[PDB]
Amino acid sequence: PDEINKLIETGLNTVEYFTSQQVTGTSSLGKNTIPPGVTGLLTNAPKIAIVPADDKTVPGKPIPNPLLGLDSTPSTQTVLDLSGKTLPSGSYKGVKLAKFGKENLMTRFIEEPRENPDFKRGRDTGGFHRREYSIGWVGDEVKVTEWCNPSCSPITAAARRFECTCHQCPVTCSECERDT
Amino acid sequence: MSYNYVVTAQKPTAVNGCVTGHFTSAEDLNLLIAKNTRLEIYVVTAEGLRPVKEVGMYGKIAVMELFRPKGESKDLLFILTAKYNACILEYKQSGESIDIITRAHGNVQDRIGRPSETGIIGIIDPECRMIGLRLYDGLFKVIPLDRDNKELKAFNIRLEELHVIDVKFLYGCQAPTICFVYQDPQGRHVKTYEVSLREKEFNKGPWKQENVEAEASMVIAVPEPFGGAIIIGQESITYHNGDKYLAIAPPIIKQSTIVCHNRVDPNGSRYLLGDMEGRLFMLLLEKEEQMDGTVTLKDLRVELLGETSIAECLTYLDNGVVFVGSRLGDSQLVKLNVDSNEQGSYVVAMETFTNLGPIVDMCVVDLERQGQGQLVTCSGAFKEGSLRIIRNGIGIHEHASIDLPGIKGLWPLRSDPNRETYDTLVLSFVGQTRVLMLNGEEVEETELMGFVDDQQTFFCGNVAHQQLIQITSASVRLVSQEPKALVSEWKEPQAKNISVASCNSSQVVVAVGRALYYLQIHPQELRQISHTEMEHEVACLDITPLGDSNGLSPLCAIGLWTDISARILKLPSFELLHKEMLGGEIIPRSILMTTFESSHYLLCALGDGALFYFGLNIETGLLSDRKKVTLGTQPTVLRTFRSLSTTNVFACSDRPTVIYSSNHKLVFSNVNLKEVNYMCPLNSDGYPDSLALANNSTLTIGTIDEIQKLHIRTVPLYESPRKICYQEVSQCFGVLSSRIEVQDTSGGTTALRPSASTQALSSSVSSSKLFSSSTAPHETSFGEEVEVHNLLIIDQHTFEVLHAHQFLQNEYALSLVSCKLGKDPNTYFIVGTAMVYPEEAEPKQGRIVVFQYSDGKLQTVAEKEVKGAVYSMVEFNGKLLASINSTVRLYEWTTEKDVRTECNHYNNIMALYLKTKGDFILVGDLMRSVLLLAYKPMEGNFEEIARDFNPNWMSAVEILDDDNFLGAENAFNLFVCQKDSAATTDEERQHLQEVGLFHLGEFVNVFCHGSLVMQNLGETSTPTQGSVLFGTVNGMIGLVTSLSESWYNLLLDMQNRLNKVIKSVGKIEHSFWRSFHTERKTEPATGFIDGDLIESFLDISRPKMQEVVANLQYDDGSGMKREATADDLIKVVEELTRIH
Amino acid sequence: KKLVIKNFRDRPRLPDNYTQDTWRKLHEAVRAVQSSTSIRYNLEELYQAVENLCSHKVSPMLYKQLRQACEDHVQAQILPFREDSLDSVLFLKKINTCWQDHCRQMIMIRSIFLFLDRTYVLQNSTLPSIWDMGLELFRTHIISDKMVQSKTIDGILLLIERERSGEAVDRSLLRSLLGMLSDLQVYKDSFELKFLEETNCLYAAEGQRLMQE
Ligand SMILES: [Zn+2]
Ligand SMILES: [Zn+2]
């Protein structure tokens, strides 16, 4: 839980942009803003806050480096050439973060659904899927693998797919579908 | 392998900037206005601004300041384009010539650099020794103001403070002092710097001040007398003068942000501040002489003046008259009362000028069905909300103008049987008349024997047998020419007064209540041929004779008052021939029979402002292909009048028009004028074949202009509009709107002011509870803004807000369309929305409502659901092709009356723009460019066909023809993709190449098929093909059309010839300006000919003309390879300027 | 290009009455459209009287006058209804004729003042059509802020409740009264709930009663 080393701008909803843009030539996304309701897990040395190195204290099939083009399957793959010339692909949020990451030594973000609530995501703070973000940047290329980490699992700079310590959690969530 | 043409149909109206000074002459006060690509120069005088010169730049005026360097008699203009095209200009006028000359020019673009936020800053030292340009980060480029820096070469210094906000040199200082505000982690510091041209670097400012206002936004540098710089923040102001530090926080600022300024005094005394929401402030720093040393500033304070337009630019002129350049509203001229009027408003509206932008959406429509589309556009933003109606109009050359406040009808006489030109004009006012004699070209008030003037005339003119006739409330009166005296006077048997009266050379008909008498005109007498009574009171008559007839009408048109009929009576008997019912609650108010091309028509016209017209055949005396249109809101009055060699009507009203037959079909041409109450032809000799018009304030004579220009009609909304559609059956429009409301502990949000949505007839809220599941945002409680979106149904004719359907809290409307689905015969208003919340990065919830304007109000028929925003939808072959976020769904309209998913496409980063031709769908992405989808009938689903492979941040998009797709992105450029024709591979078909690039300089918001020029399309060979209009944030409206390969080279060649002979207003190369340019690449230009250039050809001297066809040739489309002088191009250019 | 009239006598005007004598012909025309009388100035002349009288700076004071004319006539229409001769069916036909008339007599007016409505009032979102302006008056006093509401409502349901079980009730009388309520914008609010709240109740009973029966 930190506090000073967490000062950047929060952007607005997509639609807000869509709106503000039609009235002024000016289009805003060309600023170091982190998309609302999303947090980066990188303190090393919820705007931003420290987190456990990793965690063995529970199940945890790790997530394959996004770059080493490996198959996690239940997930989303976002490519983003930081120089045009090649079409981006994936999901909108994927792309957004992809760029926010690379431009700041940061590689992991967690998006707590708007629904409910330091970081005690476990028994109590459980019951429904969450969104995960792992990012890697070799050259102008950038790739992001995002997936769903059950509501009660922890949150670590370690990229892992968890199972379900709070046997209460869901099966398949809106985000999760389409993921292959 | 693709060719298009692009002309501007309307210069940009939004005002990017404005500056005052002495540019034209040392003794003249000037006002320079930057539109975008245009520069308007005015001159203060008294009532307003006098246009002196208006040039168009080849770039986006990014900076525009003036300076007075000792040596030059007057001021000079520094203008820096957005493509970093710098330059200085002088104003030279030698008689009939006025040139703005380039006294230097270059390009201050560095190949490296990082485009600072806060944009391009352009400043100048009061010592006028050099200019300063904060272009990229940490690099304050400097330019030497030496009288020989014609290339403008400049050096570039370093900055150890990357994030800078505002910068401005400081006055009265031995060495150029540069003050600015910069941000870092520890906050926003505000320091200074000394600059030297020899050492070519910074030395060190006289002071500094580590921690200052959290939200400092403007560095206001004060002149000689006081000195120092003021810092405007978001809630507190601070002034420094080296060793001076004050501060004040008037709660008046708390409300909103200040966004512009202007010093009112040649020395820090009084200033002007612009509020981000309309407010207008006046900040004064009450000076203070010590006791004998010098001047020291005492206390400063901010006091509210009132409300203006949303002031982008701000500039004081004279007598307390401030000019307010709005960018999302109408700019304006204001009076600064020193004597607070009612409601204590120091501000007082003087005058305003049209501002179409930002055009956020628009539809092409032809209400009259005459084959001439008009433009209704959702214009403007917040408070400046509005709709605009762009229509092609006719004008009037205004020969003369009197100041008559009360004309209630006017007629043209003829003093003597000898001369054939009028020489008189009778002007009726309320309880009286007045005869006017045209002494050649003058106006003196005579008197005429036979007539009265203590009564109010209803008619008067030259009847048969050298006699004049005056019908008034009291009686009709006959008079003589040569002898000139009263020679006969009818009258209502019992002193009753005439209510309605008709007349003409030979006959006369007048009404008295229901009583309707008929008189014939003979030698020294008014013979009373007949009399009759109608069931209801009469309200209009017209006995205009027709056919080959000899002045005698067999008929009498008429319109009555409770039954609301409009029949044609046979004269001698008043027998009935044709009785036509119409109206409902509004009566006829003006009528008139007439022959247009050779066909006779009868034209009644309600008090509504409606206008019926039938194909009245004189022979049988009956009418018969009943048509109808609407012209105004006030009861018009028809009046016939002849043109060059043809005849035609003239509908006087709030919206003046001019009926006539263009081709066995009626045509209406709103006259580019405001009100036009009464009118008559005027054939004086001093005024040849003219017209006489009277509004409520003035009588004016003049001839018809007849050179389409564009007329703009505006309907305020006081709340921002986002989309609009046209319902061809409910005769009303669809407009998604949106108002901003504040926070009030009570239970919540209250408005900010009335508006389209809060003040309408019917008005329902959404009772739909599909999201009542939870919905719990914990940021509502303390003052805040919150968009409330409504659907406004608007009346086609009156533009009154009929019904106002509100939406679910925190819900935004963003789609809209009027169509018919499946086998369902109705016609609905289908909306597309999204549930928006700041804590979310995007919407997960949204819906597709389906309405119907049954009558008086809406009625939610269908109501499907979906996860995420519905960025755009559109009627696709009966089916309903909408699109949510990454998804592109197709829907069906069952017999049960429901919409059910039926096909999808998820391969898009964000689908924002749709378009529908056949079974072809053109999709535009936020950044993934365009894609050509397709509906496979049999397959029952989607199939990508092609797609641009270049990353493009689409802004709008359109389908021109089967094979070409037009797109426009945030880069400010246009491009055209085309399905490859190398049908060799089945993969080289997955690609479509950008076969056209052009740099518009405008941020297009909407495109759309439709023209503004009278079409007359049967099979008519046109030089250009297709027609697409497009809206722009800057109010600019433009047009795009396709070309014959054969016409491209000529025009492309011609374009080139012109760029060599034409001086540029900054010595900027047209090839450069129009170069496709993004932060990424910078290709040239292609498949695009900007017609703006190819039109400046008709405005340059004839000598230069030939100096262009100079060896020019031409060969395909037509048989040639030989030269061609001007009179060839002129033909083409001219003939080509007809499509807009 | 300016212009001035030579010898603008500026004389055909010495006395003055053709104003307040026209405002008089209008008060009458109105008070006699209201209170079902017949006027004797026959419509068109009265119309032209407005169109001429109706010129900026004056139109505004005219509107206020035409408004307050009704404003007065309606408040007068209340008194009777504020009685107690209880047959919630007379009370109804009463209020219906009291509406069916105010209707045709605001339609009469509009036609006379057509010029004032479609000139001044129409050029003002601020100001309501003469029509809409009467609806707003017939609302404030009569169907609103009165026992009349809850006496018209409790009486409309009553008519239905009794058709939902074996009596007749004269469709017209209600199609009219309900229409009115609609035209007046108090339907889906001074009648809807109750109606439903009273239906999702009556039928609730029928369920049991009829299941067992
Ligand atoms: Zn999930
Ligand atoms: Zn779990």
Swiss-Prot record, chain A:
Keywords for the protein's UniProt record, in alphabetical order: Host cytoplasm, Host-virus interaction, Inhibition of host innate immune response by virus, Inhibition of host interferon signaling pathway by virus, Inhibition of host MDA5 by virus, Inhibition of host RLR pathway by virus, Inhibition of host STAT1 by virus, Interferon antiviral system evasion, Metal-binding, RNA-binding, Ubl conjugation pathway, Viral immunoevasion, Zinc
GO cellular component terms attached to this protein's record: host cell cytoplasm
Pfam families: Soyouz_module, zf-Paramyx-P
Subcellular location: Host cytoplasm
Domain of life: Viruses
Binding-site list for Zn(2+) 1: H129, C148, C173, C176
GO MF entry, a single one: RNA binding
Biological processes annotated in GO: symbiont-mediated suppression of host cytoplasmic pattern recognition receptor signaling pathway via inhibition of MDA-5 activity; symbiont-mediated suppression of host JAK-STAT cascade via inhibition of STAT1 activity; symbiont-mediated suppression of host JAK-STAT cascade via inhibition of STAT2 activity; symbiont-mediated suppression of host type I interferon-mediated signaling pathway
InterPro entries reported for this sequence: Paramyx_V_Zn-bd (IPR024279), Soyouz_module (IPR025909)
Sequence positions that bind Zn(2+) 2: C152, C164, C166, C169
Recorded family membership: Belongs to the paramyxoviruses V protein family.
Quaternary structure (record): Interacts with host DDB1, STAT2 and IFIH1/MDA5. Interacts with host RIGI regulatory protein (via CARDs domain) and host TRIM25 (via SPRY domain); these interactions prevent TRIM25-mediated ubiquitination of RIG-I and disrupts downstream RIG-I signaling.
Name recorded for this polypeptide: Non-structural protein V
Gene assigned in the entry: P/V
From Swiss-Prot, chain B:
WD repeat beta-propeller C: annotated span: 709-1043
GO MF terms, alphabetically ordered: cullin family protein binding; damaged DNA binding; DNA binding; protein-containing complex binding; protein-macromolecule adaptor activity; ubiquitin ligase complex scaffold activity; WD40-repeat domain binding
Pfam families: Beta-prop_RSE1_1st (PF10433), Beta-prop_RSE1_2nd (PF23726), CPSF_A (PF03178)
Positions of post-translational N6-acetyllysine modification: K1067
Residues covered by region (WD repeat beta-propeller A): 13-356
Places the protein is found: Cytoplasm; Nucleus
Protein name from the UniProt record: DNA damage-binding protein 1
Quaternary structure annotation from Swiss-Prot or TrEMBL: Component of the UV-DDB complex which includes DDB1 and DDB2; the heterodimer dimerizes to give rise to a heterotetramer when bound to damaged DNA. The UV-DDB complex interacts with monoubiquitinated histone H2A and binds to XPC via the DDB2 subunit. Component of numerous DCX (DDB1-CUL4-X-box) E3 ubiquitin-protein ligase complexes which consist of a core of DDB1, CUL4A or CUL4B and RBX1. DDB1 may recruit specific substrate targeting subunits to the DCX complex. (Microbial infection) Interacts with Simian virus 5 protein V.
Region: WD repeat beta-propeller B, residue numbers: 392-708
In-chain residues carrying the UniProt-annotated modification Phosphothreonine: T1125
Residues the record lists as N-acetylserine modifications: S2
GO biological process: apoptotic process; biological process involved in interaction with symbiont; cellular response to UV; DNA damage response; DNA repair; ectopic germ cell programmed cell death; epigenetic programming in the zygotic pronuclei; negative regulation of apoptotic process
Chain positions of cross-link Glycyl lysine isopeptide (Lys-Gly) (interchain with G-Cter in SUMO2): K1121
UniProt cross-references to InterPro entries, sorted A to Z: Beta-prop_RSE1/DDB1/CPSF1_1st (IPR018846), Cleavage/polyA-sp_fac_asu_C (IPR004871), RSE1/DDB1/CFT1/CPSF1 (IPR050358), WD40/YVTN_repeat-like_dom_sf (IPR015943), WD40_repeat_dom_sf (IPR036322)
Curated annotation (Swiss-Prot), chain C:
Modification after translation: Neddylated; required for activity of cullin-RING-based E3 ubiquitin-protein ligase complexes. Deneddylated via its interaction with the COP9 signalosome (CSN) complex.
Highest taxon, organism lineage: Eukaryota
Protein name, per record: Cullin-4A
General function of this protein: Core component of multiple cullin-RING-based E3 ubiquitin-protein ligase complexes which mediate the ubiquitination of target proteins. As a scaffold protein may contribute to catalysis through positioning of the substrate and the ubiquitin-conjugating enzyme. The E3 ubiquitin-protein ligase activity of the complex is dependent on the neddylation of the cullin subunit and is inhibited by the association of the deneddylated cullin subunit with TIP120A/CAND1. The functional specificity of the E3 ubiquitin-protein ligase complex depends on the variable substrate recognition component.
Family from the record: Belongs to the cullin family.
Residues of the full protein shown: 41 to 253 of 759
Gene from which the chain derives: CUL4A
Subunit structure: Can self-associate. Component of multiple DCX (DDB1-CUL4-X-box) E3 ubiquitin-protein ligase complexes that seem to consist of DDB1, CUL4A or CUL4B, RBX1 and a variable substrate recognition component which seems to belong to a protein family described as DCAF (Ddb1- and Cul4-associated factor) or CDW (CUL4-DDB1-associated WD40-repeat) proteins.
